[PDB]
């Protein structure tokens, strides 16, 4: 059915949008974790 | 082809639920990191 | 509607596969944060 297929496609797109947003969030987080790991290292913790 | 349509819609719900949990875990992580940054600043560590 | 339904299902699988990679990324971040909290603790910060 044409109408339901169309709606499904729209939902898929919105989900791909949320996945984009999520991947960015994870990348920023991993950058922050590296930054922290490195400063923890430089301040001589262990 | 209604049953295959329903099958797909079910998968979409299942995915959205997964996205939800994921977003929440991210929330918690971001707050933990904010906390760690705070205590880092407070103890006057160099770098950043 | 057949080729369209099949492509939709293809996209569903690619999304499911991405979500799996994202969960693994989150698990790794959570372990690194656990480790960071350990080191901060051992060093008597704050």
From Swiss-Prot, chain B:
Q: In which tissues is it expressed?
A: Enriched in immune tissues, such as bone marrow, macrophages and spleen.
Q: Where is the signal peptide?
A: none
| Topological domain ranges for the Cytoplasmic compartment | 1-48
Name the domain of life this protein comes from. Answer: Eukaryota
Cysteine-cysteine disulfides? none
Modification after translation is described as: Phosphorylated in vitro by PRKCD. Phosphorylation may enhance channel gating.
Coiled-coil annotated spans: 2-42
The places in or outside the cell where this protein is found are: Cell membrane; Apical cell membrane; Cytoplasmic vesicle, Phagosome membrane; Cell projection, Cilium, Flagellum membrane
Query: What does the annotation say about its assembly with partners?
Result: Homodimer; each protomer forms its own proton conduction pathway.
Explain the purpose of this protein: Voltage-gated proton-selective channel that conducts outward proton currents in response to intracellular acidification. Lacks a canonical ion-channel pore domain and mediates proton permeability via its voltage sensor domain. Provides for proton efflux that compensates for electron charge generated by NADPH oxidase activity either in the extracellular or phagosomal compartments, thus enabling the production of high levels of bactericidal reactive oxygen species during the respiratory burst.
Recorded family membership: Belongs to the voltage-gated proton channel (VPC) (TC 1.A.51) family.
UniProt domain comment: The voltage sensor domain (VSD, segments S1-S4) conducts both gating and ion permeation. The segment S4 is probably the voltage-sensor and is characterized by a series of positively charged amino acids at every third position. Unlike other voltage-gated ion channels it lacks the pore domain.
Q: What is this protein called?
A: Voltage-gated hydrogen channel 1
Annotated source species: Mus musculus (Mouse)
